[PDB]
């Protein structure tokens, strides 16, 4: 790792930067409420999942 | 009348951790002082010659150099002055050869700072807090003088030079950019040597030689 040494980052802790005060993905829970998630006309995944979720919630 | 908070698992007599003691005010100052005998320290130094054992014994005797006696001090200095020679370099312990820049430079092990701390502790013990031990015992005077001559203290460049054809300047050189900060300009034995020469000049002002009358030809 001497040729890459001047460019690549170097760390002793192994690259562990985890803040237990910030908001995590499991705490956010579901991103479909975000505007991008339900108006992302460019992702079949986003469109299909948000449609399925809204239909399931309305049915329930 | 108190009871402990947990059970103490049994242990053999040889595997105990005796020999040290915490300071008086433990809940505020947890300094650890050694109470081992100088004979034990010398036996460890002479039986286990590993560098870690050497530095541990040196630190123990440097912490115990305060309340010991003249005979124990002479014994300690005679046991310490064994691996040193006058022909070779005095206090050189160069182990690592770093050639990061153009020409290489040598980094020693912990034995050099161990010896430096020992000399400093001896200076503090025989100069500042007990200024009469040298004038009282001329044997300890000559012993510490011969030890300080055997380890080349007044030329710390020979501590860091590896080949006599290219002497080192690790101690006498220093630049404000940040090079040679901890290693340059070490006041190792200057104060002790000044105290000794002042003791030898005390005769001219005292009109009668105390040290020179106590010592032998």
């Amino acid at each position: 790792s001497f040729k890459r040494l001047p460019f690549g980052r170097r760390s002793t802790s192994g690259g562990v930067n985890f803040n237990k005060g910030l908001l995590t993905d499991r705490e956010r829970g579901d991103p479909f409420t975000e505007p991008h998630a339900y108006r992302n006309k460019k992702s079949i995944a986003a469109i299909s999942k948000v449609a399925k979720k809204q239909d399931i919630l309305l049915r329930e | 009348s108190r009871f402990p908070s947990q059970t103490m698992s049994p242990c053999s007599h040889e595997e105990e951790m005796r020999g040290y003691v915490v300071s008086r005010d433990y809940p505020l100052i947890d300094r650890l002082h050694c109470t081992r005998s100088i004979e034990e320290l010398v036996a460890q130094f002479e039986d286990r010659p590993q560098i870690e054992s050497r530095v541990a014994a040196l630190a123990d005797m440097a912490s115990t150099v305060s309340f010991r006696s003249d005979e124990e001090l002479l014994r300690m200095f005679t046991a310490i002055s064994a691996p040193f020679s006058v022909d070779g370099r005095g206090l050189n312990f160069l182990t690592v050869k770093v050639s990061k820049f153009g020409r290489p430079y040598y980094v020693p092990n912990s034995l050099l700072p161990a010896y430096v701390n020992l000399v400093d502790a001896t200076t503090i013990a025989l100069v500042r807090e007990q200024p009469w031990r040298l004038s009282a015992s001329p044997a300890l005077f000559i012993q510490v003088l011969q030890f300080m001559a055997l380890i080349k203290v007044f030329e710390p460049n020979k501590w860091f030079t590896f080949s006599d054809h290219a002497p080192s300047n690790r101690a006498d050189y220093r630049h404000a950019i940040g090079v040679n900060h901890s290693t340059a300009f070490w006041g190792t034995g200057e104060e002790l040597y000044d105290f000794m020469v002042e003791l030898l000049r005390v005769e001219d002002d005292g009109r009668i030689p105390t040290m020179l009358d106590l010592c032998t030809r």
């Binding site: 460019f7 170097r10 562990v16 005060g21 | 947890d30 300094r31 650890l32 002082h33 092990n109």
Partner: protein, 344 residues
């Protein structure tokens, strides 16, 4: 400050009775030459001057008779002894903390502060060091994050053995004045700091590696130019200098981050002396786990930090009382919040 030439230090400018050295005993008259021949032809050797005698006598009488009226004039003699905390001379060593996490708090006025919590695991005064015994050249090394023996390198475990202090992970040196010492092995409780206190912190920001000149300096990196060449302001003659080389300091692409960053004068928000936590309303750039170092701010706005109007520090270092037990004491009981402050 007010300029005061040394030549203006004559007795006609002194606010108190000017006292000449005069050997062992202070006198009110210049030292008369013992050799009479040394007397200069116009030098008027004064042995008794009724003016100065009366002035000094009345001054001493008033000082000894009305202590309440002349209390401020008592600093002319019996100065504060050495060892007590001084407002302009006593600086104390800081501590070594670990950036724990981030949260947000709110003051009573309604302002939101995005704070970061640092953790001070085991602060212990490890070493003292002075170079050749000069003035103001002494400092105290404090160690932190006690570790086992199998962790550190051999050459640093050797130093910790030589010191006798329990082997710490990190060790930072603070330059202090000799009257602020603390014995080797002294535990430093976090209550050493106060909540309404300004602190200067030093850490290492995160590492981004080699980054472009745009990302390094933002908009500043795109345009970099400096010309110290002479140029004609008026068309009278012809003469200039060619900028041959590139001047040092040219903003280019290179290493970004991973440097020693120091914030100066951030106020403390809250202190938890059960888990050894300190909260600062400033969001830092460093990662989680960077050993920050906290030190006391000297002065701000021409005003010293430690004074009677703001408060007295825990000089030299805070020592808890005996009957206090942090184990029995709860977490909610160990909370010290700073007085309110508005910044908008």
């Amino acid at each position: 400050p007010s300029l005061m030439r040394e030549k203006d230090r004559d007795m006609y400018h002194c606010y108190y009775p000017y006292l000449f050295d005069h050997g062992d005993k202070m006198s009110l008259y210049p030292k008369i030459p013992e050799n009479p021949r040394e007397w200069q032809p116009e030098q008027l050797q004064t042995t008794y001057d009724a003016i100065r005698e009366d002035k000094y006598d009345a001054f001493i009488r008033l000082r000894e008779k009305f202590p309440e009226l002349y209390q401020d004039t008592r600093a002319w003699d019996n100065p504060p002894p050495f060892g007590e905390f001084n407002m302009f001379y006593s600086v104390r060593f800081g501590m070594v903390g670990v950036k724990a996490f981030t949260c947000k708090d709110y003051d009573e006025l309604g302002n939101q502060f995005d704070c970061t919590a640092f953790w001070f695991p085991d602060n212990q005064v490890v070493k003292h060091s002075t170079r050749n015994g000069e003035v103001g050249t002494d400092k105290v090394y404090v160690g932190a994050m006690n570790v086992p023996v199998e962790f550190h390198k051999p050459h640093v475990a050797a130093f910790y053995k030589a010191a006798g202090v329990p082997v710490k992970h990190v060790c930072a040196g603070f330059p202090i004045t000799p009257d602020a010492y603390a014995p080797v092995g002294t535990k430093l409780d976090v209550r050493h700091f106060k909540p309404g206190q300004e602190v200067t912190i030093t850490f290492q920001n995160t590492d981004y590696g080699f980054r472009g000149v745009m990302f390094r300096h933002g908009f500043d990196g795109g345009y970099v130019w400096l010309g110290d060449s002479r140029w004609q302001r008026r068309p009278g003659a012809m003469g200039t200098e060619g900028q041959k080389r590139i001047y040092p300091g040219h903003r280019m692409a290179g290493q970004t981050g991973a440097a020693a960053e120091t914030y100066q004068g951030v106020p403390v928000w809250r202190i938890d002396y059960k888990n050894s936590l300190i909260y600062l309303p400033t969001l830092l750039d460093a990662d989680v786990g960077t050993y920050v170092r906290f030190s006391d701010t000297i002065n701000t706005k021409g005003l010293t930090l430690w004074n009677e109007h703001r408060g007295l520090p825990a000089f030299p270092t805070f020592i808890p009382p005996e009957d206090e037990d942090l184990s029995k004491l709860a977490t909610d009981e160990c909370q010290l919040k700073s007085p309110p402050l508005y910044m908008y």
